[PDB]
Amino acid sequence: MLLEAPVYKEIFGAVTIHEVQKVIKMDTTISNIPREKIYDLLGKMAVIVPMKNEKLHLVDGVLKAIPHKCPIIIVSNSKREGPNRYKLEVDLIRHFYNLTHSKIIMIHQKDPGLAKAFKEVGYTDILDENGMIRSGKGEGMLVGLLLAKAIGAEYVGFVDADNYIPGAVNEYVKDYAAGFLMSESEYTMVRLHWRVSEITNHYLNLLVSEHTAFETTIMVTGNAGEHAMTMKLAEILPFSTGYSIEPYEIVYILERFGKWENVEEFKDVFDQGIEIFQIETLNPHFHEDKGKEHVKEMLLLSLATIYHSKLATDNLRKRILKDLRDHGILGENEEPPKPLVMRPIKEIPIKEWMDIVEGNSETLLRFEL
Amino acid sequence: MLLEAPVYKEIFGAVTIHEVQKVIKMDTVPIYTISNIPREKIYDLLGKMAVIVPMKNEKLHLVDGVLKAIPHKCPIIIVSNSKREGPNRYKLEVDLIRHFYNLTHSKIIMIHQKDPGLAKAFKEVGYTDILDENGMIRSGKGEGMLVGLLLAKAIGAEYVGFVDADNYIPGAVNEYVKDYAAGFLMSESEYTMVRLHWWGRVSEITNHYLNLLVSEHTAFETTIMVTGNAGEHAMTMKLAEILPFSTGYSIEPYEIVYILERFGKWENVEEFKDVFDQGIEIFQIETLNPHFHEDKGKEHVKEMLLLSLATIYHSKLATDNLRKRILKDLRDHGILGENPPKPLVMRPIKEIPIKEWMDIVEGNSETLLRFEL
Ligand SMILES: Nc1nc2c(ncn2[C@@H]2O[C@H](COP(=O)(O)OP(=O)(O)O[C@H]3O[C@H](CO)[C@@H](O)[C@H](O)[C@@H]3O)[C@@H](O)[C@H]2O)c(=O)[nH]1
Ligand SMILES: Nc1nc2c(ncn2[C@@H]2O[C@H](COP(=O)(O)OP(=O)(O)O[C@H]3O[C@H](CO)[C@@H](O)[C@H](O)[C@@H]3O)[C@@H](O)[C@H]2O)c(=O)[nH]1
Numbered sequence: 001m002l003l004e005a006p007v008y009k010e011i012f013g014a015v016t017i018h019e020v021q022k023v024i025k026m027d028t029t030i031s032n033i034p035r036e037k038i039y040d041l042l043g044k045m046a047v048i049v050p051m052k053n054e055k056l057h058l059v060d061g062v063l064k065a066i067p068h069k070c071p072i073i074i075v076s077n078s079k080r081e082g083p084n085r086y087k088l089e090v091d092l093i094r095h096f097y098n099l100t101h102s103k104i105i106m107i108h109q110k111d112p113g114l115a116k117a118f119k120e121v122g123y124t125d126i127l128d129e130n131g132m133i134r135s136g137k138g139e140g141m142l143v144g145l146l147l148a149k150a151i152g153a154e155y156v157g158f159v160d161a162d163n164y165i166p167g168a169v170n171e172y173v174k175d176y177a178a179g180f181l182m183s184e185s186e187y188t189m190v191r192l193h194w195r196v197s198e199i200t201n202h203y204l205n206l207l208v209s210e211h212t213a214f215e216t217t218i219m220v221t222g223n224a225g226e227h228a229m230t231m232k233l234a235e236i237l238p239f240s241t242g243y244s245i246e247p248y249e250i251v252y253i254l255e256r257f258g259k260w261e262n263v264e265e266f267k268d269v270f271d272q273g274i275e276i277f278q279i280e281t282l283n284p285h286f287h288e289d290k291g292k293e294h295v296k297e298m299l300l301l302s303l304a305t306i307y308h309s310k311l312a313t314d315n316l317r318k319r320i321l322k323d324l325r326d327h328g329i330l331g332e333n334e335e336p337p338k339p340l341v342m343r344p345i346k347e348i349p350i351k352e353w354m355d356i357v358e359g360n361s362e363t364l365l366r367f368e369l
Numbered sequence: 370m371l372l373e374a375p376v377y378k379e380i381f382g383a384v385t386i387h388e389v390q391k392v393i394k395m396d397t398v399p400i401y402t403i404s405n406i407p408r409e410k411i412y413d414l415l416g417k418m419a420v421i422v423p424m425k426n427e428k429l430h431l432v433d434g435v436l437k438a439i440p441h442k443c444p445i446i447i448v449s450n451s452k453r454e455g456p457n458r459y460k461l462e463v464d465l466i467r468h469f470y471n472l473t474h475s476k477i478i479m480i481h482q483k484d485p486g487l488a489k490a491f492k493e494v495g496y497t498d499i500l501d502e503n504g505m506i507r508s509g510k511g512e513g514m515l516v517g518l519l520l521a522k523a524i525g526a527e528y529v530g531f532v533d534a535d536n537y538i539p540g541a542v543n544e545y546v547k548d549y550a551a552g553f554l555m556s557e558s559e560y561t562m563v564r565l566h567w568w569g570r571v572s573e574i575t576n577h578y579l580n581l582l583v584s585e586h587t588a589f590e591t592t593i594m595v596t597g598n599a600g601e602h603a604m605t606m607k608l609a610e611i612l613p614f615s616t617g618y619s620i621e622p623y624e625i626v627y628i629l630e631r632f633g634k635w636e637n638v639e640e641f642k643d644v645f646d647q648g649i650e651i652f653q654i655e656t657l658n659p660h661f662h663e664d665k666g667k668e669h670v671k672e673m674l675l676l677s678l679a680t681i682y683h684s685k686l687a688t689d690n691l692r693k694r695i696l697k698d699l700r701d702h703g704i705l706g707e708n709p710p711k712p713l714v715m716r717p718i719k720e721i722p723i724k725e726w727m728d729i730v731e732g733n734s735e736t737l738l739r740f741e742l
Contacts, residue, residue: 002473025473026543028441039396039408064657067396099403100371100394167540167658170395282434282539 001038001178005031006277010218012208013258014270016185020193020220020278023175031182038177043069045228046153047173048144050137051076053085054161056092058288062161063096065169070157071369072102073147075140077109090365103369105147109133109140113361117353125342138245138342145234146345150354151369155180157228160287168283176228179277187233187269189249190277191221194285196295200247200302203320207306208254210313221278222247223302233274235346236266244301244339250276251309296329304336370397370411370547372654374404375555379593381583382633383645389566389595389653392548404555411550416442418603419526420546421517423510424534425450426458429465431535431663436469438539439532440546444742446520447479448513463738476742478520482506482513486734490726498715511620511715518609519718523727524742528553530563530603533662541658549603552652560608560644562624563652564596567660568702571670572598575622575677578695582681583629585688596653597622598677608649610719611641619676619712625651630686671704679709 002025009018024030047070051059066072074093078085086108093106107114115133118126126142128134133143141158148156157176159169172192179190204222209215221227224246229237240248253274256266263270306312307320324330357364371394378387397405420443424432439445447466452458459481466479480487488506491499499515501507506516514531521529530549532542545565552563568574575597584590596602598621604612615623628649631641638645681687682695699705730737 024437025441025475026438026539028473030472061657064392064394068394069396099400101398101400102394165538165540165658166395167538167544171540282437284537 001026001033001035001174002028003031003033003178003182003279005029006182010216012254013260014273015253015257016273016275017218018275018277019218020280022280023171023282026171026282033178033181037181038174039067039069041155041177041180042067042173044153045155045157045173045176046071046073046148046151047157047159048073048075048141048148049159049161050140050144051078051089051161052137052140053078055288056088058163059089059161060092060096061166062159062163062169063093063102064100065166066102066159067170067173068100068102070173071148071151071153072104073144074104074106075109075144075147076106077135077140080108080110086363093365097367101368104365104367105151105369106363106365107143107147107361108363109135109143111361111363113357113359113364114143116360117356120356121348121353123343123345123348125340134241136242138239138241138243141245142239142342142345146348146350146353149231149235149345149350154231155228156231156234158226160225162288162290164286164288165283168281168286171281171283172226175279175281179228179279180230182277183275185272185275186230187272188230188275188277189233190228190279191224191246192226193221193224193278193280194283196299196302197223199299199323200306203303203306203316204247204250206316206319207251207309207311210316211311219250222250236269236344238344239342240305241340241342242301243298244305247302247305248339248341251305251311255309255311300324300329300336301339305339307336308338370395370406370408370551371400372404372406372551372555374402375652376402379591381629382635383648384628384632384651385648386593386651387653388593389655391655392544392657395544395657406551406554410554411547412442414528414550414554415440415546417526418528418530418546418549419444419446419521419524420530420532421446421448421514421521422532422534423448423450423513423517424462425513426452427534428663429461431537432462433465433469434539435532435534435536435542436475438543439475440543441473441475443546444476444478444524444526446517447477448482448517448520449479450482450508450513453481453483459736466738470740474741477738477740478524478742479738480516480520480730480734481736482508482516484734484736486732486737487516487730489733490729493729494721494726496716496718496721498713507616509617511614511616511618514620515614515715515718519721519723519726522606522610522718522723527606528603529606529609531601533600535663537661537663538658541656541661544656544658545601548654548656552603552654553605555652556650558647558650559605560647561605561650561652562608563603563654564599565601566596566599566653566655567658568698571674571677574674575681578678578681578691579622579625581691582626582684582686585691586686594625597625598673611644611717613717614715615680616713616715617676618673619680622677623680623712623714626680626684626686630684633686671702675699675704675709676712679712682709683711
């Protein structure tokens with residue numbers, strides 16, 4: 001694969017944010033990551049696919065696009081009765097495995113065996129009030145992260161299921177790989193790119209240029225649904241609820257590692273640094289339209305995340321408030337609610353959590369994995 | 370890569386038409402009813418295939434995305450019929466191709482279809498089927514492809530594959546080129562064709578009359594043919610050199626029509642005995658990616674329609690019933706009057722002394738552009 005070389009970038013504390021790189025030649029001042037090495041790192045990377053009532057044909061399409069050596073981890077939160085939508089997914093995953101023999105782990109987000117392993121090990125941030133796993137994409141992604149960890153993955157990749165272009169999924173995974181192959185740190189994150197988006201980036205760069213007195217544009221993925229991390233970084237990041245999860249990754253990292261304070265706590269991260277790559281994909285971004293109400297909830301908690309940043313300023317908040325209010329989304333004297341943030345899965349006795357899950361969960365399916 | 374095994378088919382004379390197969394898994398122990406074509410094999414095959422990209426006035430960033438997705442080891446051959454003055458748009462393409470070459474060092478050959486040096490080589494060698502009233506090369510895609518094919522031949526390619534430029538999904542392009550190799554790897558014959566699949570759509574309607582062209586002689590109707598209008602296809606130079614190419618958009622459906630009226634019966638075998646011995650194998654693969662081109666308008670849409678159907682209507686294999694109902698819904702729709710033309714067909718390029726032809730082209734063409742190829 002040929003890419004523009006990571007020539008430029010910006011540096012806040014121990015965080016290196018690279019300028020967006022375009023893919024130049026999809027298959028082989030310019031960087032050259034060969035196919036053999038990409039396809040090579042690939043087997044150490046688990047691709048997590050958060051699923052929810054998605055259409056079976058798009059799901060199938062996405063599944064077929066993941067390169068065979070990537071272990072696939074699926075976490076559905078689909079309607080489970082009237083009709084049992086999950087069973088419909090179980091049927092497809094079973095047919096898919098018979099026709100491909102792809103290594104796949106799948107589980108439902110609301111499975112009682114999951115809530116039990118979480119209570120037992122003392123991790124409660126992911127539970128609703130009834131002690132059941134809370135609905136949300138970040139919530140399912142977190143579960144995916146522990147499963148990927150339970151199988152000893154070094155890198156994790158997220159890809160959505162409502163994609164009209166299987167081919168784009170195939171490129172996302174290879175783009176992640178190249179993103180880690182161009183990295184020098186053990187703590188690396190690769191985010192991808194192709195209005196919610198633009199609005200979130202606008203305020204994210206604003207979040208930074210308020211202290212630096214220089215308006216910036218560096219961040220173009222504040223809202224990347226498609227992204228990836230080295231298990232090492234993923235385990236120390238606290239994760240936010242539902243759709244607020246990718247924006248918060250950025251906000252938390254800047255907040256915690258953008259200055260040199262409390263370095264003794266993360267001595268190794270501060271030394272190696274955090275590297276964030278932003279790769280522009282060749283294939284267009286095309287999802288199922290989920291409707292206007294859905295587009296408004298996302299906008300809401302992605303902007304609420306920036307609003308509560310301990311980095312947000314007087315001015316940053318009002319500008320948000322205004323927009324958030326004159327688009328029929330926030331009260332005229334209402335402040336956006338603080339999105340719930342869950343703690344870093346790090347401290348969890350993984351294999352022990354894995355055996356409680358493995359010995360009490362009715363929805364867990366494993367295939368050569 | 371995984372596909373559904375080439376289990377079912379239909380045979381007509383020395384022509385075998387495979388049931389459409391689906392790509393099932395993208396990058397790759399045996400699986401029942403599944404064929405496994407390992408990356409290793411597809412990749413050592415690619416350096417042997419020339420990808421031809423006919424193009425005419427397409428948006429530059431699109432042409433860009435397509436070139437970027439073609440595997441690096443495939444030689445690219447571009448034939449442009451793009452506008453020449455006010456503005457010289459071919460000049461724009463030359464610029465994008467040069468910048469693309471400096472960043473990737475891909476092997477590329479580009480030339481403009483109307484190049485006066487090209488009309489000189491065709492005419493000098495005795496090939497006039499491609500020329501207009503006034504000795505200059507005729508506009509039309511079948512025509513561009515024919516030029517691309519001769520260039521592909523000049524550089525010694527064993528396989529040629531066509532990929533359109535007005536594609537919105539680069540990823541798809543990358544998949545097509547691989548689906549072609551897969552098709553040729555599963556083949557047993559040296560004359561092999563691989564076609565991709567993804568009132569009503571023109572596609573659906575073309576196939577309906579083509580299948581009917583066949584059932585009209587079989588007293589059985591089929592739905593075997595699913596790629597009548599396959600703009601994305603590939604052939605072994607071997608098969609490509611003995612096929613006579615139809616004009617404009619009629620080229621694809623005519624390939625099927627010709628092979629059927631020429632090799633669908635065991636007659637006059639002497640002239641193509643190796644072809645009859647080997648047989649013609651035709652693969653039909655349904656791609657994982659959807660089909661998505663820039664739409665060109667109502668006008669363009671039925672020009673294609675008329676041409677595709679005119680071509681089945683004039684087949685020596687066609688009957689009265691067929692011809693009659695093709696007329697019915699060509700008129701019932703805005704296309705025809707109530708008073709179709711036979712599309713022009715050019716001969717096979719098998720007998721054109723490539724070397725003499727190529728070095729005349731190479732010697733007289735003001736638009737030819739080469740790169741490590
Ligand atoms: N497990 C689980 N998955 C979920 C849930 N909610 C949504 N998902 C899945 O997460 C993926 C994305 O969610 P969508 O609801 O489809 O959002 P979108 O409009 O597709 O937007 C996506 O791409 C944007 C790119 O800018 C992202 O910003 C956004 O977060 C999301 O990933 C889909 O596969 C969806 O089914 C959930 O509650 N639990
Ligand atoms: N060299 C050359 N190229 C041409 C010409 N006319 C069209 N092309 C190119 O041939 C490709 C065909 O695209 P269009 O002519 O817009 O046709 P389309 O609507 O995209 O339909 C195509 O795909 C269909 C798939 O079923 C095909 O059926 C159809 O024949 C064509 O290939 C494009 O890259 C187009 O620029 C020409 O006169 N000369």
